[PDB]
Amino acid sequence: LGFIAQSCLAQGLSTMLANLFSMRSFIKIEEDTWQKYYLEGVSNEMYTEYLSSAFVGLSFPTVCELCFVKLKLLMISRILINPGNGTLGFFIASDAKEVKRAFFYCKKKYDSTGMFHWCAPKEIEKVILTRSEAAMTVLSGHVVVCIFGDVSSALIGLRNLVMPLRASNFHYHELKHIVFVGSIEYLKREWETLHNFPKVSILPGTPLSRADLRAVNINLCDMCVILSANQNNIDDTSLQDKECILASLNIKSMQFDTTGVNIPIITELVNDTNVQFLDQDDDDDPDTELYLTQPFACGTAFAVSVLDSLMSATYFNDNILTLIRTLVTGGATPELEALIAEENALRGGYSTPQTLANRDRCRVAQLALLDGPFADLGDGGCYGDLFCKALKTYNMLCFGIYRLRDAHLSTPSQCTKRYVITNPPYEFELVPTDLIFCLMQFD
Amino acid sequence: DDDDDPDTELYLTQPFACGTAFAVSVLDSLMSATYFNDNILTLIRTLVTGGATPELEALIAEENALRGGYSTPQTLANRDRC
Amino acid sequence: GPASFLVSLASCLALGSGLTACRARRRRLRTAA
Amino acid sequence: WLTAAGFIHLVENSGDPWENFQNNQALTYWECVYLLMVTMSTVGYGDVYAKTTLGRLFMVFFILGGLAMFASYVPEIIELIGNRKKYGGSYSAVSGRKHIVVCGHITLESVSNFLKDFLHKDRDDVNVEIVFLHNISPNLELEALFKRHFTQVEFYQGSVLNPHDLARVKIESADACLILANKYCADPDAEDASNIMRVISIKNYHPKIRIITQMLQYHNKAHLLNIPSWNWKEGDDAICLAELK
Amino acid sequence: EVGWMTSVKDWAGVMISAQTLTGRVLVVLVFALSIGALVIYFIDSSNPIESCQNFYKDFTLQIDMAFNVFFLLYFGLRFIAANDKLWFWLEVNSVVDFFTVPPVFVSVYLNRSWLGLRFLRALRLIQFSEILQFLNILKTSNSIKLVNLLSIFISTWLTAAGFIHLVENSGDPWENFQNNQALTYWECVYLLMVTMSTVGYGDVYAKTTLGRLFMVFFILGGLAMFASYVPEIIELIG
Ligand SMILES: [Ca+2]
Ligand SMILES: [Ca+2]
Ligand SMILES: [Mg+2]
């Protein structure tokens, strides 16, 4: 759910986050396709390494930026992400052989803590909506969650989905509205924990209904999430996510006053085989792995099977798991774990100067390229200059490139799906139509 | 008041021949007729269930609930069906 | 062996082609009748 | 087998020591192999047998451990060798003759009814070849029915969900795809679900193909309209049996 | 047009099946002449391994020539209608045709008859369930399975007995054919029945090196066949 929410904040983040943990060796293909560039980003894994004595001098932060040219590697006492303003460097090196180059080379508004947002409890009747008011209410760039459930269905737990979207550096004006569509009985069952959350709406019905989706302004939503809970009841392989897929398709097949095929929608699949049904303009082979599938590479698909590699990475150095918990789901401060353990219900209080000071966290964001002062680097032909300028001007580091699938071909196309690139090489050509992953700071 | 033999087919049975019996098994032959020229299925849909106009299919798809409005001269003109 | 097998195969193919040709013109040339 | 045969050869050629090696039967190694094969197979011709005291003792102590071994290994070895896919391979696309693919609920009665209605002499002289695609291998009755339609139908065992099996039946040149439905089911929703899956799976491989299918409910038929490539204009069909009934 | 090769392939496929009167006649003729060839091999078994017989002064050789000519024509018809040529070449009926017809042709040419692989004609007995299913006589699953089991069992039994007869009558070549046991075909049938039934009286048995080798390699594949077919055949009959 944290990866899903991260993808909602910035599309394609879940795919690269999952790929950063799986150990993949470098592979090359002769043909020039979209997979050729994608496979150059999956080769980068998440590592932990100590710093050198050359970087322990006047200041830890100022040396971190712009030093990646010499080291040819990326950097990301305590948990440190984009350190601005003995330390374990969270690297994105492609292998453990060349990661030994840092130390070796020497030339009531908030919650009880302020990590999230809190508001007065709400009653289920004060948030239940209807097609009349849902269409009347205006929603743009919001979050829509399609929930499948029944009377005897299992419990997913939506508290971990709205939590990542309500971080400290997310202002109330910038907070993304979340609306849940599905059976009201399931939401009533989950309402015991889903009541201290602000800016939430629930529309009864089913996600398979076009009118209910039309009411909640699906066309202009920032991200559509398809989730299911009944898959633990049926044991038939063919029938499993036989659901979810139909809805993803109805979403794609809708027609507005344009077609909804380009609507950003992410689907959770329990069976990895069903992913071939997500897209029709792609090669479907059961032999290929999930990470090679186009819908997964584009950030529109996610499965729990890619998280099984987390155990091996966690074992070798445990610092990664807490880094994951502070990179997704907002932040898992030691105190918050105890508070959740003892009350099992998030509560807040009056803010303090130190409470507001707990806001220096930098969170992910998606940046365009068509407009901005950095337009000179839109087609500069060198990716390294782009992130060097980002670091040396506005203090922002980019994970990589969110690139169009058909941008590699000279002829134009109407394709909209974009796949993820993690840490492109220094001599990497750029395209004017592109999206940039970044860790924006607070203000 | 009829001869009951398990060997005989449903279409030969007196209650079915008199229109007092119906089963979904007689509709399995619809696929073969539909394949050879598809115009029959829409002819079936316009001969039974009143009429399946292209617009009505979309309206049922999007709201899943039949609704009406004020009539128009062209709306009343859509009545020449026999 | 092989020569007799080839002769039998050629005879079968010729008989089939001749029968097909005879039936074809018997059927088409008399479609109206 | 070889170790027992070698031990018998050594014992029979080299007589028992307490008899001053005076029981040399002069048995070749191949003869001992044959004797071991006969003895552990329970047949026991008796033309070749052990005569020395040690040979008879080893035969007695080897019968118990070898008869069971033979009876438990030979049929099982045959069973593992016989594991094969009878209805494999792909379909060859013949030029000038269109073919259709039929999948879904395939059964002796349904297939027979479809064949007798599709291939009736009442229709015009049209030569369309039917290719079946089912996961479960046909039984003797269904194979016998297919034999009576030797030049008109073919069967290929496989799953419609697998894109490889769809390429095996060559849907690229197929005229139409036909999906039968299990009307007499205990869960119409589940049957419509599986069928909507094939609908999709077929669409994912080749959107351009036309589909004639049976739906037991009207809401599932409405859900079929949500499929992106539900091109009913050029050709597509969805017979709702409940609606038509 | 529509393909001349496809037209003749479809014509042969219709002819092989019993879909037309000519097809049914050909199928019945194949059945009858397979039975007749088996009977002819049974009669000719009493003759020595090698002999000289005049084609135009003998009554059996002419009938055998007609039978194998018809079998050659049927093989050609099957080959025209065959889907895959390589896998049709490896079928059991094709192999027995290849090892049965050319030797009789050579025997007619050379005026000298050798009882070699003529026992393979019993393998033609296998293709009987397909013959009955083409004629629509055999429909129900139980009877189809019973006919399949009976045909396979009898064909394998007769083929093994014929191979034993050939091997025992014609001694191993490396011993200058000095191991002629002089076993009648009925005696070989009895020996095969006894051996695959596990009983093993031992009064009749193979003494040649090739005969013992075939017995060893046939016990494994025949004891299981007998034990799995005879009780099951009895069950379907009952
Ligand atoms: Ca790597
Ligand atoms: Ca696909
Ligand atoms: Mg065919």
Q: Which residues pair with A128 in a beta bridge?
A: A202
Beta-bridged to residue D108, according to DSSP, are: none
Tell me whether residue D149 is exposed, middle or buried, using C-beta atoms within 10 angstroms of its C-beta: 0 to 12, 13 to 18, 19 or more: middle
CB contact under 8 A, B49 and D243: yes
Instruction: Please give the Cα distance from E53 to A298 (Å, whole number).
Output: 83
DSSP for B32-57 reads HHHHH-THHHHHHHHHSSS---HHHH
Instruction: Output the furthest CA–CA distance in chain B (Å, rounded).
Output: 57
DSSP state of A208: T
Contacts of D33 (CB under 8 A, 6+ apart): D1, D2, D5, E216
Dihedral over alpha carbons D230, D233, D234, D238 (to 10 degrees): 50
For chain D, which chains pass the contact test of at least 3 CB pairs under 8 Å? A, B, E
Q: Which of A414, A379, A386 is nearest to A66 (CA)?
A: A386
**Cα–Cα distance for residue pair E27/E40, rounded to 1 Å:** 20
CA distances from E107 to C9, E33, E102, E144 (A): 22, 20, 9, 38
Q: CA-CA distance, D14 to D54, in Å (whole number)?
A: 10
The letter for the amino acid at A126 is: K
Q: Which two tokens stand for residue D98?
A: 């269109």
Chain D positions in Cβ-Cβ contact with residue B34 (cut-off 8 Å): 212, 237, 239
Residue window 11-30, chain C: list those with CB within 8 Å of chain E.
Answer: 11-13, 16-17, 19-20
On the 0-12 / 13-18 / 19+ scale of CB atoms within 10 A, E43 is: exposed
Contacts of D233 (CB under 8 A, 6+ apart): none
- Cβ neighbours of A209 in B, within 8 Å: 64
Q: Residue B64: closest CA among chain A residues belongs to which residue?
A: A209
If we measure between CA atoms, which residue out of D150, E16, E87 comes closest to residue E8? E16
Separation of first and last alpha carbons in chain C: 48
Q: How far apart are CA D28 and CA D47, in angstroms?
A: 14
- The C-alpha of A210 sits at a distance from chain B's nearest C-alpha, in angstroms, of 5
DSSP assigned state of A75: B
Name the CA dihedral angle for A96, A99, A104, A105, rounded to a multiple of 10 degrees: 150
| Ligand of minimum distance to the alpha carbon of A293 | 2
Spacing, Cα A288 to ligand 1 middle (Å): 19
Positive or negative CA dihedral for D17, D21, D22, D25?
positive
- Chains B and E touch each other (3 or more Cβ pairs < 8 A): no
Asked if A79 and A49 count as a contact pair (C-beta separation under 8 A), the reply is no
- DSSP output for A226-260: EEESGGGT---TTTTTHHHHHHHHHHHH-B---BG
* Residues, CB within 5 angstroms of ligand 2 (ion): A 276, 282, 284; D 204
Instruction: Identify whether the C-beta of residue A191 lies closer than 8 Å to the C-beta of residue A124.
Output: yes
For residues E12 and C11, give the distance between their C-alpha atoms in angstroms, rounded to a whole number: 13
Task: Report in angstroms the alpha-carbon separations of E101 from A44, B81, E25, E38, E44.
Answer: 69, 73, 22, 14, 16
What count of CB pairs under 8 Å joins D to E? 87
Determine C/B contact with 3+ CB pairs under 8 A as the test: no
Angstrom distance (rounded) from CA A76 to CA A6: 17
Which of B35, B43, B55 to mutate: most D Cβ within 10 Å?
B35
For residue E59, which phi and psi values (nearest 5 degrees)? -95, -20
Give distance in angstroms: CA of A291 to centre of ligand 1: 14
Looking at chain B, how many residues does it have? 82
Sheet of strand A223-228: strand arrangement: A200-203, A178-182, A143-148, A223-228, A265-268, A301-302
Chain D residues with CB-CB distance to E224 below 8 A: 74-75, 78
Task: Return d(Cα E121, Cα E125) in angstroms, integer.
Answer: 7
Asked if D193's CB is within 8 angstroms of A242's CB, the reply is yes
Q: Give the chain A residue nearest D200 (alpha carbons).
A: A277
Amino acid at A35: Q
Residue in E14, E83, E144 nearest the CB of D140: E144
User: In angstroms, what is the span from residue A96 Cα to ligand 1's centroid?
Assistant: 8
The answer to whether the CB of A115 falls within 8 A of the CB of A336 is yes
Q: How crowded is residue E19: how many other Cβ atoms within 10 Å of its Cβ? A: 17
Residues on B contacting D at a C-beta cutoff of 8 Å: 22, 24-25, 27-32, 34-36, 38, 41, 44, 48-49, 57, 60-61, 64
Q: Which residues of B touch D126 (CB under 8 A)?
A: 36
Amino acid at A365: A
Whether residue D74 and residue E141 make contact (CB cut-off 8 A), yes or no, is: no
Residue carrying structure tokens 């451990």 = D65
8 Å CB contact between E60 and E45: no
Q: Are D95 and E141 an interchain contact pair (Cβ–Cβ within 8 Å)?
A: no
Q: Residue D12 corresponds to which amino acid?
A: E
Q: Is E202 helix (H, G, I), strand (E, B) or coil?
A: coil
Report DSSP state, residue A175.
P
Ligand (nearest to CA of A284): 2
Could D245 and B57 be called an inter-chain contact, meaning their C-beta atoms sit closer than 8 Å? no
Q: Is A438:A397 a contact under the CB 8 Å cutoff?
A: yes
* β-bridge pairing A418-422 and A400-404: antiparallel
Q: How far apart are CA E194 and CA D98, in angstroms?
A: 55
E-side interface with C, Cβ within 8 Å? 4, 7-8, 11-12, 72-73, 75-77, 79-80, 98, 101-102, 105-106
Q: How far is the alpha carbon of D77 from chain E, nearest alpha carbon, in Å? A: 10
Nearest-10 crossing angle of helices E60-81, E4-16: 130
What is d(CA B17, CA B23) in angstroms, rounded to the nearest whole number? 12
Q: Give the β-pairing of D129-134 and D99-104.
A: parallel
- E strand or H helix that includes residue A215: helix A210-215
Q: Tokens 């896919």 label which residue?
A: D85
Angstroms from A213 CA to nearest CA on chain B: 10
Q: Do chains D and B touch (3 or more CB pairs under 8 A)?
A: yes
D176 CA → ligand 3 middle, Å:
17
The beta-strand segments (E) located in D73-228 are 99-104, 129-134, 153-157, 174-180, 211-215
For residue A147, give the 3-state DSSP assignment.
strand
DSSP reduced 3-state for A382: coil
Residue A335 token pair: 């105190």
Instruction: Point out residues after which chain B has a gap (C–N over 2.5 Å).
Output: none
Nearest-CA distance D176 → chain B (Å): 8
Distance CA E18, CA E20 (A): 6
Q: Which two tokens stand for residue B64?
A: 């899943």
> What tokens does D126 get?
């049209």
Task: Render the burial of A233-272: b for 16+ CB within 10 Å, e for the rest.
Answer: eeeeebbbbbbbbbbbbbbbbbeeeeebbebbbbbbbebb
Q: Tokens representing A148?
A: 């499948």
C-alpha torsion angle, residues A307, A311, A314, A315 (rounded to 10) = -170
